[PDB]
């Protein structure tokens, strides 16, 4: 059941009715899971945390990408640390989806 993908998105571009379902969306002030039914589920992060993650992930390849990339190394860049941090947040929030 669990999502495998995420993307950054701007708030005025995020339309749950037409966005890809079962996917994580990182906005500049919120982190959400769009579940398989199209329900936006908040993932409990402060706007400040989200602003930091949103702005740390700058590589074009990583704007719309996979959640648990085995080749990410948080010790090599702030971007990869932020991607790994988001993955750990999502993993914890998805703990009981299966």
Numbering used by the authors: 128 to 225
Can you quote the paper on this entry?
Here, we demonstrate that MavC actually targets the Ube2N–Ub conjugate to catalyze an intramolecular transglutamination reaction. MavC-catalyzed transglutamination proceeds via an obligate thioester-linked intermediate to form an isopeptide bond between Gln40Ub and Lys92Ube2N. Architecturally, MavC1–384 is composed of three distinct lobes: a core globular domain (CG) flanked by an insertion domain (residues 128–225) on one end and an α-helical extension (HE: residues 33–66, 356–384) on its opposite end. Ubiquitination of Lys92Ube2N, located adjacent to the E2 active site, effectively inhibits Ube2N activity and attenuates downstream host NF-κB activation.
The MavC insertion domain can be expressed and purified on its own, and a crystal structure of the insertion domain shows that it preserves an identical fold to that in the full MavC protein. BLI and glutathione-s-transferase (GST) pulldown experiments show that the isolated insertion domain is able to bind to Ube2N independently and with an affinity comparable to full-length MavC. An analogous NMR titration using purified MavC insertion domain (MavC128–225) yielded Ube2N spectral changes that are remarkably similar to those observed with C74A-MavC1–384 despite the large molecular weight differences. These observations suggest that the MavC insertion domain is primarily responsible for binding Ube2N, a conclusion supported by similar Kd values obtained from BLI measurements of Ube2N binding to MavC or the MavC insertion domain. The insertion domain appears to behave as an independent Ube2N-binding domain but when built into MavC its rotational states provide specific functionality during the transamidation reaction.
